[PDB]
Amino acid sequence: KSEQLLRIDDHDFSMRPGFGGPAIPVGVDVQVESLDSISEVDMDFTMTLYLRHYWKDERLSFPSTNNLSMTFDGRLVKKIWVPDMFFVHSKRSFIHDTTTDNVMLRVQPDGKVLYSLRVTVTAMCNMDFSRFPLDTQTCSLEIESYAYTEDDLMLYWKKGNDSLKTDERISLSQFLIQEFHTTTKLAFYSSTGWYNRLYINFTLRRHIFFFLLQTYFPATLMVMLSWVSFWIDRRAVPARVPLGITTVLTMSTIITGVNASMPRVSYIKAVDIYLWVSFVFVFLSVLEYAAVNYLTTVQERKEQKLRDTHAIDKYSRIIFPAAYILFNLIYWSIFS
Amino acid sequence: KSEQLLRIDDHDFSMRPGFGGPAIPVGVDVQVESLDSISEVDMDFTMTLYLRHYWKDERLSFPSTNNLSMTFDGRLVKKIWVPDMFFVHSKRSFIHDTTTDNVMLRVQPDGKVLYSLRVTVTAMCNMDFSRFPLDTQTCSLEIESYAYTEDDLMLYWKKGNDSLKTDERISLSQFLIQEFHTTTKLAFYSSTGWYNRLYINFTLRRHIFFFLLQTYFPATLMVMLSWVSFWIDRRAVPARVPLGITTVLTMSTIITGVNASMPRVSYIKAVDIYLWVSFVFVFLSVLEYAAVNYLTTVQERKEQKLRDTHAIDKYSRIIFPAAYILFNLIYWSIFS
Amino acid sequence: KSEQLLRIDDHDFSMRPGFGGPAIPVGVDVQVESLDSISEVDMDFTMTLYLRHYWKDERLSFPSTNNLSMTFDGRLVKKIWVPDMFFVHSKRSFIHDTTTDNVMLRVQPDGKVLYSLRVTVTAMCNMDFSRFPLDTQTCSLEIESYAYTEDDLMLYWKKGNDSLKTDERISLSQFLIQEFHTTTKLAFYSSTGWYNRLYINFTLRRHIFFFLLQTYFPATLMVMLSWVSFWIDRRAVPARVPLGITTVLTMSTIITGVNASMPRVSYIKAVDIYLWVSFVFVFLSVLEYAAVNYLTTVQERKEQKLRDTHAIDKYSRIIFPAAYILFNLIYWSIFS
Amino acid sequence: KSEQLLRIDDHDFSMRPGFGGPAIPVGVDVQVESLDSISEVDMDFTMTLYLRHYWKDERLSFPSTNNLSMTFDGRLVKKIWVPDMFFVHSKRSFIHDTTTDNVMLRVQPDGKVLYSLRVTVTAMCNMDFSRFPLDTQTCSLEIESYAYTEDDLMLYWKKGNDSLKTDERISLSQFLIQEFHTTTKLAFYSSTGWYNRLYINFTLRRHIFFFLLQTYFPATLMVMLSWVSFWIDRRAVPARVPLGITTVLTMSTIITGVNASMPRVSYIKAVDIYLWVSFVFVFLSVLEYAAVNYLTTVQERKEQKLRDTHAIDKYSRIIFPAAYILFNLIYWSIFS
Amino acid sequence: KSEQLLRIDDHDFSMRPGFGGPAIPVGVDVQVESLDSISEVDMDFTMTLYLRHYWKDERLSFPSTNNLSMTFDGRLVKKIWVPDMFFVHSKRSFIHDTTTDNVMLRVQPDGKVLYSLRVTVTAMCNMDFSRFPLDTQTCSLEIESYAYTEDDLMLYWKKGNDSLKTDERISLSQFLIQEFHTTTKLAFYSSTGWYNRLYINFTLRRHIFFFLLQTYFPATLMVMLSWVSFWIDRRAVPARVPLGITTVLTMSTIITGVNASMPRVSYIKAVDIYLWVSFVFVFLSVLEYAAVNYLTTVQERKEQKLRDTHAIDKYSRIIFPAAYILFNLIYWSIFS
Ligand SMILES: C[C@]12CC[C@@H](O)C[C@@H]1CC[C@@H]1[C@@H]2CC[C@]2(C)[C@@H](C(=O)CO)CC[C@@H]12
Ligand SMILES: C[C@]12CC[C@@H](O)C[C@@H]1CC[C@@H]1[C@@H]2CC[C@]2(C)[C@@H](C(=O)CO)CC[C@@H]12
Ligand SMILES: C[C@]12CC[C@@H](O)C[C@@H]1CC[C@@H]1[C@@H]2CC[C@]2(C)[C@@H](C(=O)CO)CC[C@@H]12
Ligand SMILES: C[C@]12CC[C@@H](O)C[C@@H]1CC[C@@H]1[C@@H]2CC[C@]2(C)[C@@H](C(=O)CO)CC[C@@H]12
Ligand SMILES: C[C@]12CC[C@@H](O)C[C@@H]1CC[C@@H]1[C@@H]2CC[C@]2(C)[C@@H](C(=O)CO)CC[C@@H]12
Ligand SMILES: *[C@@H]1O[C@H](CO)[C@@H](O)[C@H](O)[C@H]1NC(C)=O
Ligand SMILES: *[C@@H]1O[C@H](CO)[C@@H](O)[C@H](O)[C@H]1NC(C)=O
Ligand SMILES: *[C@@H]1O[C@H](CO)[C@@H](O)[C@H](O)[C@H]1NC(C)=O
Ligand SMILES: *[C@@H]1O[C@H](CO)[C@@H](O)[C@H](O)[C@H]1NC(C)=O
Ligand SMILES: *[C@@H]1O[C@H](CO)[C@@H](O)[C@H](O)[C@H]1NC(C)=O
Ligand SMILES: CCCCCCCCCCCC
Ligand SMILES: CCCCCCCCCCCC
Ligand SMILES: CCCCCCCCCCCC
Ligand SMILES: CCCCCCCCCCCC
Ligand SMILES: CCCCCCCCCCCC
Ligand SMILES: CCCCCC
Ligand SMILES: CCCCCC
Ligand SMILES: CCCCCC
Ligand SMILES: CCCCCC
Ligand SMILES: CCCCCC
Ligand SMILES: CCCCCC
Ligand SMILES: CCCCCC
């Protein structure tokens, strides 16, 4: 029996290696296999990965006439001491078990141990949609020991920045992913002490042209369409009135349609500002012709009682586009 | 073996410490890590947190030549007595188990015990949407012993109001969160007796300006647009009629669009009252011109058989806006 | 050890108390804590509650110099005999286990036992939507023994109608809840025999005014708006035609919008009948003016070849509203 | 102890009764309690039922001075041999366990055994939507032994067609259910051999009138409305043009609305054919008036340069309805 | 006892057969039972299948006076050595367990073993929607050993391309499935070594005619409808203006409706290009008439101050359709 080569029954494996002295170093490597989903309303993401640990234990040494190592599956884990890592700020997670538990242990003649397992985790990521669709988000995944302070266990990246590998075809449907890297930082708990924490960081971006074409293009076209009425004969009331009112109706349908297709986040975003400013421009263009028609009617009635282009149209033909151009300059200087 | 330092086999751990005498005090601390989601239709919320217990047991004392404590994981829990806390008014919950059970026990030489675990819970929160979108909601989470009355176990906050800590970046997507605090109260069960209950309270609010801009602004603009027809020449029937009917159509589309984007709660809310009053104003403006056209036609026919601005327009130009202003004053004095 | 006070090893606990003789009575009490959700398309509901059992077993008696009782948690359940209750017509259910199993046992010196546990259950409830939104539904939850017939186990409510308690703040978002009460009935299985079954009954109702304002009000307003054209000068074709066709378009949008917000139940309901009758009225009002215009044109052409209000408008002004009023009387006498 | 009346330790229960000789017959009965849901996009259904087995084993015989039988729960199952049935073509399933496992065993003095359990299963059902909404679907549930060929185990319906019972109130929200019955058939696996398979069959149908009123009625009404323009004076251009274009807009909104309410199945169905043919009719009616207006204008210009009803309207008034009637005859002769 | 015919206690089953020498070959067969679902936003699919292994172990040989084999269920698996296969790039999976674990073992007198189990798996499949709805996708499922390198275990398809069988009625609701086949490839891990990997490949396609009729047909019809105004008398302003503006409104509603029914993928696809080009054509047709009306008005005013078909219409009648035809030629030569 291979488990008799390790004196299992001859040691207390409820205490750590080196108990009573300096802390035992434990080195970590990570391989990311995929990014599974993201939730914008609930603000979290899901990832699948391999986690590997390295440490030394002299109680595990066995004699050999060679330099061959022995390999075990997850049934040995409950018989020896292993590190207790957990994921900070996570909502749910599990270890894969088909067709059997996805756990491996390899033990060297001198007591060096490698511990490997496959896991899926869902973690939180606070997001800010104030600059949507031009926003940028940063997320992280964090790794920590549950019960051992830095005085008993010293956790570190085994090879620095070479300790993280990512799959060549990692991708998300609605985001672009860039800039993977690792960091470390000490954290403090008033109940027990100081602990080491490791981080995995990355950044997300959207596709800007899709949103430009889908939202900003039609609004601008409808605003430009509402200026056509300034060049139409003011005596054609049955053609001036329906045009303005239908233009309002079209802009309202566009805004409702856009609202139905964005994530349900209930506070004010940049695209909303653009859309409602354009709606106000369309409203003002109807008020203009109302004024013109009233004034013309008054003039005609006065002339008959006593017995060309109106100035408002001439000024509006210049003033409306200039003000829209100035709004656009300010908006795009502010939101980049 | 460390479990032989505690005389495990030498005591009955199916009875409480101090059995037969006064109740044993048990002190509680809570650290909230995050707020995961909220459901407005089902009226509940989800939270993730650390729960810590403190008590003393003389049967656990062990000799030491030092003041060092021993630490265990969750396999020891089934061998000793521990408190049986549960969450009142909850729908589902679980304890995290990756990469192993997230449970810790620390035992002092004199028998003081600390018990720590990590848990996620979903709890109910009755809500009232009568003043939507200006409503305010209050929620709570409650903690109680399942089987021990106040005569056997005394449950209390360890440090009063300093016993609750919350994460610095706790947030929800559609709500603002404020005013965390703790309370206690005795409850009575006719089947067994009196029990101590602990509470965690907080308050939620919405973003008012988003809703103002999205709902109240367009309705008011359309009501103001329907008043334009009072200044148009009454002889232009083909321009007066289509304008009113298209204005009705636009207001109906706006109302349907707003209805599709609120949570599906089927009783009457404030915003509904605002919207349907505005719809009635738009309807009345079409009835006005119907009356005017009929009366003008009668007058002309009478004059021809025998062989300026109509008064109704002049009065309507004043009466409609005053009545809308009075409605707005009353509405906003009532709903703040 | 407290489990040695009960002679556990000295009795066969795979047989019932009183085996071989009359049936053992078992009394039941229920406390409802909350109503969690309801599903109209799948026709089921979810509930969370406490279930308590009472019976006597002389094999459990122990000596005492006092009248104190002993309390156990769920680890004792597998060592003694307990009743096997299950929920009839249910789809899924589970027993809460945080922070430990929510099970209690209390044993009196003379062998009286109390058994308590906390459970969540989803059960079916056949529904009829023919009179929507004026429908009423009745639901029930049923409790039965799986393996013991009335000859071996007699199941009954411990205190009659006082055996059911409900929480003071029980509520559902879209329903009103009323009239909780209990009943009993015998059921028969051809495979094994007769069994006792217990019932918990309640009733659900909707908020009628919300639905009135959201659906019936706009339809009636549009039908009334289509009658305006009967008072308009028949020589204004460019004002009579667009009005009818836009009125049809508005009514169609209203009907689509209403259809998108009701539960997806694919058979005919009362509100559908109301809406499609109103649509038919709006269609008929356009056919009327088509007839009037054709006849006027014929008359003018005839008069010119040879070389006031038309009767159809005068009759329509009376006939349309009377017929709508009669439809409303019949409809509301039929559907209450 | 009742388990000592059966010589449990005295037989190898890892082999079947009658090992080494002819196959052992096993008889099956089924009671369906409910139909829980159906998924049209994923093409599956869910059902809840009781499954009962009957067979004889002489190793289970025990002496009795009477004809009373002994009853056990599911803890005995792991100590004796039982049949290994499984559900073919299923996606997921489980056995109910509240408040304990829903399993029963009854053993007669002579070794006759009854085995009963309660189970929920989700199974696939390939569907064809080509004739929607006039389609008919057939589904089945299949039962088979996992490891024993017909040479070792003979599986059959205990009582033929009397072996299946269904609940009196079984129903689905959007379907009608009819024609339950059972069948049997042999299947062949090249890896191991021939096996017996049992079937449960039933049929589903929709409510036709709901779909008629919701879809076919409005389309036909709009097609009939577009024919009104053939009777309108050809000199009223501002009344002929808006009518056709608004009629197109109404038909497009109707089609979009209908599309949003059917199950998302992306291939061509009958109702789509009806709707797009009607759209083409509405398009052609606008092309007609375009032609008429152009020709009239040419004639007038020619007459002035040189210095009644147009035939196209007269022919269209007959030709359009006849062609629609012929389309309807062919369509309804093809799709029933 | 049948487990005493195999000397279970007489061998260490924690090491592989042939330990210390050449690798042991293991042969694999697969039978696909169904394709359960596909997720376009999350980019994955689900499948249910039978997995079978073949290998030889001399420690399992037993004497027989015949050539009969012994069969076991899944309780034997934990007592002997078996291969540890797992699914690469998968998100979740499980082994069916109703009414018992769906596992079988068959052992020949000479030590040949067959191992069979039933499993459901969800795997990732990166997709590209740039050519939607004319796109083609390829997916695969991959099988690998977790802990043994090619030096210890040699994994291969038992019968080459005859090793894969698929069900005759396998289907998906919105896709067509074709071209199943198998491949093999070596993979390299820097932590442990080289491993053998097996692949199952297939291809998916859509139904093109459904999408043609639903999207491309209405857009083209509306573009053709906007050309009607070039043949209408330029003096009929109240008929030329409403027609263009309503045509814009109809096209906008069509585009919103189409957007609401495609999978929510936020980057630019071919159908979007088609739709927005058609929208631009409709916009240009309104700008044309604006120009024509302005120029006519100028001419009339000049003539009066001093005291037929306009050229722009004549050129537009030719130029618009030619340019649309050229766009269509280029588009369909590019996207096939
Ligand atoms: C072309 C369009 C969208 C389509 C019409 O509404 C016109 C605007 C004009 C301003 C443009 C904008 C696209 C996004 C631009 C290029 C901005 C960016 O650098 C984005 O990061 C700055 C100015 C923006
Ligand atoms: C500006 C707007 C919304 C946009 C148009 O409809 C005009 C109203 C006028 C009344 C305003 C309201 C915004 C919300 C106000 C300020 C109310 C509040 O204190 C909210 O708590 C009281 C009066 C309300
Ligand atoms: C006011 C309104 C709805 C709003 C407009 O459509 C007008 C109808 C008129 C008939 C009313 C109905 C509301 C519901 C009533 C009162 C019915 C009920 O007792 C309901 O149980 C009987 C008559 C119904
Ligand atoms: C009344 C209506 C629907 C409502 C308008 O579109 C007119 C058609 C006319 C043809 C009818 C159809 C209803 C369904 C019928 C009766 C068909 C069936 O036997 C159905 O199985 C054959 C002819 C069909
Ligand atoms: C008939 C229709 C759609 C309906 C109207 O928009 C007109 C176009 C004309 C061009 C056609 C297209 C259908 C798809 C075709 C046949 C393309 C394909 O081979 C598809 O793989 C090449 C040319 C395309
Ligand atoms: C790892 O590399 C990243 C690359 O951006 C850098 O930011 C970071 O500081 C590096 N960390 C260490 C420990 O070298
Ligand atoms: C805790 O502090 C809160 C702060 O609002 C207060 O309301 C509450 O009464 C305090 N409770 C105790 C026990 O001090
Ligand atoms: C319980 O009370 C309800 C109240 O409605 C009554 O209908 C029922 O008959 C009562 N049952 C018994 C057993 O008293
Ligand atoms: C069972 O009855 C059904 C009723 O339709 C019949 O089709 C079937 O053949 C019958 N089967 C047997 C085995 O009698
Ligand atoms: C299996 O058959 C497929 C059929 O396309 C072929 O592509 C593949 O190369 C074949 N593989 C082997 C190993 O024969
Ligand atoms: C309709 C005309 C829109 C013009 C927009 C100009 C935007 C300029 C942005 C300059 C950023 C530096
Ligand atoms: C269209 C004019 C709306 C005017 C609204 C006035 C609201 C005043 C609220 C005063 C609250 C004290
Ligand atoms: C538009 C007028 C609607 C009138 C509806 C009258 C309904 C009367 C119901 C009487 C029930 C007894
Ligand atoms: C608008 C007129 C529709 C007429 C439809 C007639 C359908 C006849 C079906 C005959 C089936 C035998
Ligand atoms: C409205 C006219 C559309 C004409 C489209 C022609 C497409 C030709 C494609 C040729 C591919 C080789
Ligand atoms: C392809 C980018 C288009 C942007 C139109 C505003
Ligand atoms: C837009 C304001 C114009 C004023 C011209 C007098
Ligand atoms: C709005 C009512 C006006 C009445 C004027 C006589
Ligand atoms: C508040 C009830 C309103 C009903 C309108 C029909
Ligand atoms: C609505 C029918 C009126 C007929 C008058 C002659
Ligand atoms: C619809 C075609 C009519 C042709 C009459 C000459
Ligand atoms: C479309 C441009 C036409 C120009 C004719 C002069």
XYZ file of N, CA and C in Angstrom, chain E residues 261-303:
129
model
N -35.865 41.887 -31.818
C -36.087 40.450 -31.960
C -34.833 39.659 -32.283
N -33.700 40.296 -32.377
C -32.446 39.611 -32.604
C -31.728 39.402 -31.282
N -30.790 38.459 -31.214
C -30.043 38.283 -29.968
C -29.209 39.516 -29.656
N -29.126 39.840 -28.368
C -28.536 41.097 -27.909
C -27.016 41.016 -28.020
N -26.515 41.249 -29.227
C -25.082 41.239 -29.497
C -24.681 42.636 -29.949
N -23.760 43.279 -29.224
C -23.595 44.722 -29.430
C -22.348 45.011 -30.263
N -22.423 44.596 -31.523
C -21.499 45.073 -32.540
C -22.163 44.914 -33.899
N -21.496 45.438 -34.920
C -22.160 45.747 -36.180
C -22.282 44.489 -37.033
N -23.487 44.227 -37.550
C -23.744 43.066 -38.396
C -24.298 43.520 -39.742
N -24.266 42.599 -40.711
C -24.599 42.907 -42.104
C -26.003 43.492 -42.255
N -26.970 42.909 -41.554
C -28.362 43.314 -41.688
C -28.528 44.755 -41.223
N -27.770 45.161 -40.199
C -27.760 46.557 -39.773
C -27.316 47.482 -40.899
N -26.270 47.087 -41.629
C -25.788 47.893 -42.748
C -26.887 48.062 -43.790
N -27.549 46.958 -44.157
C -28.646 47.055 -45.121
C -29.717 48.032 -44.638
N -30.119 47.902 -43.370
C -31.251 48.685 -42.878
C -30.926 50.175 -42.813
N -29.720 50.533 -42.360
C -29.408 51.954 -42.234
C -29.139 52.606 -43.590
N -28.602 51.862 -44.564
C -28.543 52.402 -45.923
C -29.946 52.693 -46.454
N -30.900 51.786 -46.219
C -32.247 52.081 -46.703
C -32.833 53.312 -46.005
N -32.567 53.462 -44.705
C -33.038 54.652 -43.998
C -32.487 55.926 -44.629
N -31.207 55.919 -45.009
C -30.615 57.099 -45.638
C -31.296 57.412 -46.967
N -31.584 56.382 -47.771
C -32.331 56.638 -49.006
C -33.658 57.346 -48.718
N -34.400 56.867 -47.714
C -35.690 57.496 -47.417
C -35.519 58.954 -46.987
N -34.463 59.256 -46.231
C -34.195 60.641 -45.819
C -33.928 61.553 -47.029
N -33.085 61.075 -47.941
C -32.754 61.861 -49.126
C -33.989 62.180 -49.961
N -34.966 61.262 -49.992
C -36.146 61.550 -50.816
C -36.967 62.733 -50.297
N -36.910 63.035 -48.996
C -37.584 64.217 -48.454
C -36.783 65.479 -48.748
N -35.453 65.375 -48.671
C -34.657 66.565 -48.993
C -34.898 67.041 -50.433
N -35.092 66.092 -51.354
C -35.380 66.417 -52.751
C -36.580 67.362 -52.897
N -37.723 66.983 -52.318
C -38.913 67.813 -52.475
C -38.769 69.145 -51.766
N -38.036 69.185 -50.649
C -37.792 70.480 -50.016
C -37.151 71.443 -51.015
N -36.105 70.968 -51.700
C -35.424 71.790 -52.704
C -36.377 72.248 -53.808
N -37.211 71.329 -54.297
C -38.107 71.630 -55.417
C -39.102 72.716 -55.024
N -39.691 72.586 -53.838
C -40.671 73.575 -53.408
C -40.040 74.959 -53.252
N -38.854 75.032 -52.631
C -38.194 76.330 -52.482
C -37.948 76.986 -53.835
N -37.425 76.219 -54.796
C -37.088 76.812 -56.087
C -38.333 77.280 -56.835
N -39.416 76.494 -56.791
C -40.642 76.937 -57.449
C -41.152 78.249 -56.854
N -41.126 78.359 -55.525
C -41.630 79.558 -54.866
C -40.806 80.776 -55.275
N -39.476 80.626 -55.314
C -38.615 81.725 -55.760
C -38.995 82.166 -57.167
N -39.180 81.201 -58.073
C -39.485 81.559 -59.457
C -40.787 82.347 -59.546
N -41.833 81.869 -58.868
C -43.115 82.569 -58.918
C -43.008 83.986 -58.359
N -42.331 84.145 -57.216
C -42.182 85.481 -56.644
C -41.428 86.407 -57.592
N -40.369 85.902 -58.233
C -39.615 86.729 -59.173
C -40.487 87.161 -60.344
N -41.246 86.218 -60.907
C -42.107 86.538 -62.040
C -43.127 87.604 -61.672
